[PDB]
Design a protein around this ligand. Sequence first.
Ligand SMILES: COc1cc(Oc2ncnc3cc(OC)c(OC)cc23)ccc1CC(=O)Nc1cnn(C(C)C)c1
Length: 308
Amino acid sequence: LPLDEHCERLPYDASKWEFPRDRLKLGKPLGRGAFGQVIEADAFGIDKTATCRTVAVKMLKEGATHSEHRALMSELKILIHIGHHLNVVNLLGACTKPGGPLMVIVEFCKFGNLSTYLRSKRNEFVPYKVAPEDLYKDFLTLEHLICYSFQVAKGMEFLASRKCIHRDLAARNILLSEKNVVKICDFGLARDIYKDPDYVRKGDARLPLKWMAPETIFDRVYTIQSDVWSFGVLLWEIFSLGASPYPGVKIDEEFCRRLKEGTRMRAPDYTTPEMYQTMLDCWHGEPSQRPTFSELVEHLGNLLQANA
Ligand SMILES: COc1cc(Oc2ncnc3cc(OC)c(OC)cc23)ccc1CC(=O)Nc1cnn(C(C)C)c1
Protein backbone atom coordinates (compact mmCIF):
# COMPACT_ATOMS: atom_id res chain seq x y z
CA LEU A 1 0.00 0.00 0.00
CA PRO A 2 2.75 2.46 -1.19
CA LEU A 3 2.24 6.26 -0.66
CA ASP A 4 4.60 7.17 -3.55
CA GLU A 5 2.00 5.93 -6.14
CA HIS A 6 -0.37 8.88 -5.41
CA CYS A 7 2.09 11.84 -4.80
CA GLU A 8 -0.11 14.41 -6.58
CA ARG A 9 -2.40 14.54 -3.52
CA LEU A 10 0.51 15.14 -1.03
CA PRO A 11 1.04 18.74 0.30
CA TYR A 12 3.75 21.31 -0.41
CA ASP A 13 4.01 23.72 2.57
CA ALA A 14 5.82 26.75 0.98
CA SER A 15 5.94 28.58 4.35
CA LYS A 16 8.35 25.90 5.67
CA TRP A 17 10.32 24.65 2.61
CA GLU A 18 10.51 27.54 0.18
CA PHE A 19 14.07 28.87 -0.16
CA PRO A 20 14.64 32.24 -1.93
CA ARG A 21 16.52 31.77 -5.25
CA ASP A 22 18.72 34.81 -4.38
CA ARG A 23 20.17 32.92 -1.36
CA LEU A 24 21.39 30.06 -3.52
CA LYS A 25 24.75 30.34 -5.31
CA LEU A 26 24.93 27.63 -8.02
CA GLY A 27 28.26 25.89 -8.70
CA LYS A 28 29.56 22.94 -10.77
CA PRO A 29 27.41 20.03 -12.06
CA LEU A 30 27.91 16.81 -10.12
CA GLY A 31 26.17 14.78 -12.90
CA ARG A 32 24.93 15.44 -15.61
CA GLY A 33 21.89 13.33 -16.45
CA ALA A 34 19.37 13.11 -19.26
CA PHE A 35 16.47 15.47 -18.42
CA GLY A 36 17.67 16.26 -14.88
CA GLN A 37 20.93 17.30 -13.26
CA VAL A 38 22.46 17.58 -9.79
CA ILE A 39 24.53 20.75 -9.11
CA GLU A 40 26.80 21.62 -6.19
CA ALA A 41 25.69 24.97 -4.60
CA ASP A 42 26.23 27.31 -1.67
CA ALA A 43 23.01 28.04 0.23
CA PHE A 44 23.00 30.97 2.63
CA GLY A 45 21.23 30.17 5.91
CA ILE A 46 19.22 27.18 4.63
CA ASP A 47 19.38 25.29 8.01
CA LYS A 48 21.37 27.51 10.45
CA THR A 49 20.82 31.28 10.66
CA ALA A 50 23.24 33.21 8.38
CA THR A 51 25.50 30.22 7.81
CA CYS A 52 26.87 29.34 4.32
CA ARG A 53 26.39 25.61 3.55
CA THR A 54 27.39 23.45 0.56
CA VAL A 55 24.26 21.71 -0.80
CA ALA A 56 23.28 19.51 -3.78
CA VAL A 57 20.50 20.82 -5.99
CA LYS A 58 18.37 18.74 -8.38
CA MET A 59 16.79 20.53 -11.31
CA LEU A 60 15.84 20.01 -14.92
CA LYS A 61 17.82 20.69 -18.07
CA GLU A 62 17.42 21.25 -21.82
CA GLY A 63 15.23 18.46 -23.17
CA ALA A 64 12.89 18.24 -20.15
CA THR A 65 9.18 18.93 -20.72
CA HIS A 66 6.25 19.91 -18.41
CA SER A 67 5.86 16.08 -17.57
CA GLU A 68 9.39 16.04 -15.99
CA HIS A 69 8.53 19.26 -14.15
CA ARG A 70 5.44 17.48 -12.66
CA ALA A 71 7.66 14.51 -11.79
CA LEU A 72 10.21 16.66 -9.95
CA MET A 73 7.39 18.34 -7.97
CA SER A 74 6.07 14.86 -6.98
CA GLU A 75 9.62 13.94 -5.90
CA LEU A 76 9.81 17.04 -3.66
CA LYS A 77 6.37 16.17 -2.12
CA ILE A 78 7.50 12.54 -1.37
CA LEU A 79 10.80 13.84 0.20
CA ILE A 80 8.75 16.11 2.44
CA HIS A 81 6.43 13.15 3.42
CA ILE A 82 9.39 10.81 4.10
CA GLY A 83 11.15 13.32 6.37
CA HIS A 84 14.58 13.08 7.93
CA HIS A 85 16.76 10.17 8.99
CA LEU A 86 20.56 9.94 9.30
CA ASN A 87 20.66 7.35 6.48
CA VAL A 88 18.40 9.08 3.89
CA VAL A 89 19.56 12.17 1.89
CA ASN A 90 17.75 14.95 3.76
CA LEU A 91 15.72 17.61 2.04
CA LEU A 92 16.74 21.14 3.09
CA GLY A 93 14.45 23.29 0.91
CA ALA A 94 13.17 24.03 -2.57
CA CYS A 95 12.69 26.89 -5.07
CA THR A 96 9.22 26.48 -6.61
CA LYS A 97 8.19 30.13 -7.33
CA PRO A 98 7.36 31.14 -10.96
CA GLY A 99 10.08 32.80 -13.08
CA GLY A 100 12.78 30.24 -12.39
CA PRO A 101 13.37 26.47 -12.51
CA LEU A 102 11.98 24.11 -9.85
CA MET A 103 14.96 23.16 -7.63
CA VAL A 104 15.11 20.53 -4.91
CA ILE A 105 17.87 21.14 -2.35
CA VAL A 106 19.43 18.39 -0.21
CA GLU A 107 22.42 17.94 2.11
CA PHE A 108 25.72 17.57 0.29
CA CYS A 109 27.53 14.13 0.60
CA LYS A 110 31.22 14.85 0.08
CA PHE A 111 32.41 11.44 -1.13
CA GLY A 112 29.69 10.84 -3.76
CA ASN A 113 28.15 7.44 -4.65
CA LEU A 114 29.24 4.30 -2.75
CA SER A 115 29.82 2.15 -5.86
CA THR A 116 32.53 4.48 -7.28
CA TYR A 117 33.97 5.03 -3.78
CA LEU A 118 34.46 1.35 -2.91
CA ARG A 119 35.95 0.65 -6.36
CA SER A 120 38.44 3.55 -5.92
CA LYS A 121 39.42 2.25 -2.41
CA ARG A 122 39.60 -1.48 -3.43
CA ASN A 123 43.43 -1.51 -3.05
CA GLU A 124 43.28 0.24 0.40
CA PHE A 125 41.38 -2.62 2.07
CA VAL A 126 42.35 -4.89 4.98
CA PRO A 127 39.76 -7.27 6.60
CA TYR A 128 41.12 -6.37 10.10
CA LYS A 129 43.48 -3.49 11.07
CA VAL A 130 46.62 -4.89 12.82
CA ALA A 131 48.61 -2.66 15.27
CA PRO A 132 50.99 -0.75 15.12
CA GLU A 133 51.42 -0.48 11.27
CA ASP A 134 47.73 0.06 10.20
CA LEU A 135 46.76 2.18 13.33
CA TYR A 136 47.26 5.61 11.60
CA LYS A 137 46.27 4.50 8.06
CA ASP A 138 42.73 5.25 6.85
CA PHE A 139 42.06 1.78 5.37
CA LEU A 140 38.65 0.24 4.60
CA THR A 141 38.00 -2.76 6.86
CA LEU A 142 35.34 -5.53 7.16
CA GLU A 143 33.89 -3.41 10.06
CA HIS A 144 33.39 -0.40 7.65
CA LEU A 145 31.63 -2.62 5.07
CA ILE A 146 29.32 -4.22 7.65
CA CYS A 147 28.71 -0.71 9.05
CA TYR A 148 27.69 0.64 5.52
CA SER A 149 25.39 -2.44 5.12
CA PHE A 150 23.83 -1.78 8.58
CA GLN A 151 23.27 1.95 7.82
CA VAL A 152 21.56 1.18 4.45
CA ALA A 153 19.24 -1.39 6.20
CA LYS A 154 18.45 1.33 8.86
CA GLY A 155 17.64 3.85 6.09
CA MET A 156 15.46 1.24 4.28
CA GLU A 157 13.63 0.30 7.50
CA PHE A 158 12.95 4.06 7.98
CA LEU A 159 11.68 4.39 4.36
CA ALA A 160 9.40 1.33 4.81
CA SER A 161 8.06 2.97 8.05
CA ARG A 162 7.03 5.97 5.89
CA LYS A 163 5.07 3.58 3.53
CA CYS A 164 7.54 4.20 0.72
CA ILE A 165 9.56 1.84 -1.44
CA HIS A 166 12.73 2.69 -3.35
CA ARG A 167 12.46 0.66 -6.64
CA ASP A 168 16.08 1.35 -7.69
CA LEU A 169 18.14 0.33 -4.62
CA ALA A 170 21.81 -0.15 -5.65
CA ALA A 171 25.25 1.11 -4.55
CA ARG A 172 25.09 3.90 -7.27
CA ASN A 173 22.07 5.28 -5.26
CA ILE A 174 23.94 5.33 -1.95
CA LEU A 175 25.97 8.42 -1.06
CA LEU A 176 28.83 8.65 1.36
CA SER A 177 29.16 11.64 3.68
CA GLU A 178 31.68 12.55 6.45
CA LYS A 179 32.16 10.37 9.60
CA ASN A 180 31.45 7.21 7.50
CA VAL A 181 27.72 8.09 7.19
CA VAL A 182 25.92 6.63 4.11
CA LYS A 183 22.67 8.02 2.73
CA ILE A 184 20.11 6.41 0.46
CA CYS A 185 19.16 8.67 -2.50
CA ASP A 186 17.51 8.30 -5.95
CA PHE A 187 19.16 10.20 -8.82
CA GLY A 188 16.22 9.39 -11.12
CA LEU A 189 16.09 11.82 -14.12
CA ALA A 190 19.56 13.19 -13.08
CA ARG A 191 21.20 9.92 -14.16
CA ASP A 192 21.48 9.28 -17.92
CA ILE A 193 19.84 5.80 -17.80
CA TYR A 194 20.10 5.62 -21.62
CA LYS A 195 23.97 5.84 -21.51
CA ASP A 196 24.35 3.79 -18.27
CA PRO A 197 25.18 0.05 -18.67
CA ASP A 198 23.39 -0.74 -15.35
CA TYR A 199 20.06 -0.13 -17.18
CA VAL A 200 18.96 -2.63 -19.85
CA ARG A 201 16.21 -2.23 -22.51
CA LYS A 202 13.05 -4.22 -21.58
CA GLY A 203 10.19 -3.17 -23.85
CA ASP A 204 9.98 0.64 -24.07
CA ALA A 205 11.79 1.17 -20.70
CA ARG A 206 15.42 1.07 -19.45
CA LEU A 207 15.41 -1.02 -16.25
CA PRO A 208 18.08 -1.96 -13.65
CA LEU A 209 17.76 -5.69 -14.48
CA LYS A 210 20.74 -6.92 -12.37
CA TRP A 211 19.11 -5.47 -9.19
CA MET A 212 15.49 -6.58 -9.78
CA ALA A 213 13.68 -9.43 -8.00
CA PRO A 214 12.12 -12.22 -10.27
CA GLU A 215 8.58 -10.99 -9.40
CA THR A 216 9.63 -7.50 -10.61
CA ILE A 217 11.17 -8.67 -13.94
CA PHE A 218 8.40 -11.26 -14.70
CA ASP A 219 5.28 -9.81 -13.00
CA ARG A 220 6.16 -6.04 -12.75
CA VAL A 221 5.57 -6.36 -8.95
CA TYR A 222 7.37 -3.69 -6.77
CA THR A 223 7.12 -4.10 -2.95
CA ILE A 224 9.33 -3.60 0.11
CA GLN A 225 10.31 -7.28 -0.31
CA SER A 226 11.60 -6.65 -3.90
CA ASP A 227 13.70 -3.83 -2.30
CA VAL A 228 15.08 -6.58 0.07
CA TRP A 229 16.17 -8.49 -3.07
CA SER A 230 17.96 -5.31 -4.37
CA PHE A 231 19.50 -4.90 -0.91
CA GLY A 232 21.04 -8.41 -1.29
CA VAL A 233 22.50 -7.27 -4.67
CA LEU A 234 23.74 -4.03 -2.90
CA LEU A 235 25.48 -6.29 -0.23
CA TRP A 236 27.21 -8.14 -3.08
CA GLU A 237 28.43 -4.79 -4.55
CA ILE A 238 29.68 -3.75 -1.07
CA PHE A 239 31.56 -7.03 -0.35
CA SER A 240 32.96 -7.19 -3.95
CA LEU A 241 34.23 -3.60 -3.24
CA GLY A 242 32.23 -2.01 -6.09
CA ALA A 243 32.29 -4.75 -8.78
CA SER A 244 29.42 -5.01 -11.29
CA PRO A 245 26.90 -7.86 -10.41
CA TYR A 246 26.69 -11.20 -12.34
CA PRO A 247 30.24 -10.85 -13.83
CA GLY A 248 30.52 -12.16 -17.41
CA VAL A 249 26.78 -13.04 -17.59
CA LYS A 250 24.82 -11.80 -20.66
CA ILE A 251 21.73 -9.99 -19.34
CA ASP A 252 19.09 -11.51 -21.62
CA GLU A 253 15.96 -13.77 -21.54
CA GLU A 254 18.08 -16.81 -20.44
CA PHE A 255 19.50 -14.86 -17.45
CA CYS A 256 15.91 -14.01 -16.29
CA ARG A 257 14.78 -17.69 -16.72
CA ARG A 258 17.86 -18.99 -14.75
CA LEU A 259 17.15 -16.40 -11.99
CA LYS A 260 13.43 -17.42 -11.86
CA GLU A 261 14.55 -21.08 -11.40
CA GLY A 262 16.88 -20.29 -8.44
CA THR A 263 20.32 -19.51 -10.01
CA ARG A 264 22.23 -16.98 -7.79
CA MET A 265 25.60 -15.16 -7.81
CA ARG A 266 28.62 -16.88 -6.21
CA ALA A 267 30.17 -15.21 -3.09
CA PRO A 268 32.12 -11.94 -3.69
CA ASP A 269 35.93 -11.76 -2.92
CA TYR A 270 35.73 -9.78 0.37
CA THR A 271 32.65 -11.34 2.09
CA THR A 272 32.42 -13.26 5.40
CA PRO A 273 30.38 -16.55 5.29
CA GLU A 274 27.45 -14.98 7.25
CA MET A 275 27.35 -11.89 4.94
CA TYR A 276 27.06 -14.29 1.94
CA GLN A 277 24.28 -16.20 3.78
CA THR A 278 22.51 -12.79 4.28
CA MET A 279 22.73 -12.24 0.45
CA LEU A 280 21.18 -15.68 -0.23
CA ASP A 281 18.44 -14.98 2.35
CA CYS A 282 17.62 -11.64 0.55
CA TRP A 283 17.52 -13.61 -2.70
CA HIS A 284 14.88 -16.17 -1.61
CA GLY A 285 12.56 -16.87 -4.58
CA GLU A 286 9.48 -16.34 -2.33
CA PRO A 287 9.22 -12.59 -1.36
CA SER A 288 7.48 -13.41 1.98
CA GLN A 289 10.43 -15.69 2.93
CA ARG A 290 13.06 -12.91 2.52
CA PRO A 291 14.05 -11.09 5.77
CA THR A 292 12.37 -7.74 6.45
CA PHE A 293 14.55 -4.59 6.80
CA SER A 294 13.80 -4.64 10.61
CA GLU A 295 15.21 -8.20 10.73
CA LEU A 296 18.26 -7.15 8.63
CA VAL A 297 18.88 -4.17 10.96
CA GLU A 298 18.91 -6.53 14.03
CA HIS A 299 21.11 -9.12 12.22
CA LEU A 300 23.68 -6.61 10.85
CA GLY A 301 23.79 -4.78 14.20
CA ASN A 302 24.60 -8.14 15.92
CA LEU A 303 27.30 -8.88 13.24
CA LEU A 304 28.79 -5.39 13.82
CA GLN A 305 29.08 -6.10 17.58
CA ALA A 306 30.52 -9.62 16.87
CA ASN A 307 33.09 -8.14 14.37
CA ALA A 308 34.40 -5.82 17.18
C1 LIG B 1 19.35 17.18 -4.94
O1 LIG B 1 18.77 15.87 -4.89
C2 LIG B 1 19.58 14.80 -5.09
C3 LIG B 1 20.96 14.89 -5.20
C4 LIG B 1 21.70 13.73 -5.41
O2 LIG B 1 23.07 13.78 -5.52
C5 LIG B 1 23.86 14.22 -4.50
N1 LIG B 1 23.34 14.61 -3.35
C6 LIG B 1 24.22 15.00 -2.43
N2 LIG B 1 25.55 15.05 -2.52
C7 LIG B 1 26.07 14.64 -3.71
C8 LIG B 1 27.47 14.67 -3.88
C9 LIG B 1 28.04 14.26 -5.06
O3 LIG B 1 29.38 14.25 -5.31
C10 LIG B 1 30.27 14.69 -4.29
C11 LIG B 1 27.23 13.82 -6.13
O4 LIG B 1 27.92 13.44 -7.25
C12 LIG B 1 27.19 12.92 -8.36
C13 LIG B 1 25.86 13.79 -6.00
C14 LIG B 1 25.26 14.19 -4.78
C15 LIG B 1 21.08 12.50 -5.53
C16 LIG B 1 19.70 12.42 -5.43
C17 LIG B 1 18.93 13.56 -5.21
C18 LIG B 1 17.42 13.47 -5.10
C19 LIG B 1 16.91 12.26 -4.33
O5 LIG B 1 17.64 11.55 -3.64
N3 LIG B 1 15.57 12.08 -4.40
C20 LIG B 1 14.91 11.07 -3.68
C21 LIG B 1 13.61 10.64 -3.96
N4 LIG B 1 13.22 9.69 -3.14
N5 LIG B 1 14.28 9.50 -2.32
C22 LIG B 1 14.19 8.48 -1.26
C23 LIG B 1 14.60 9.07 0.07
C24 LIG B 1 15.05 7.29 -1.62
C25 LIG B 1 15.32 10.32 -2.61
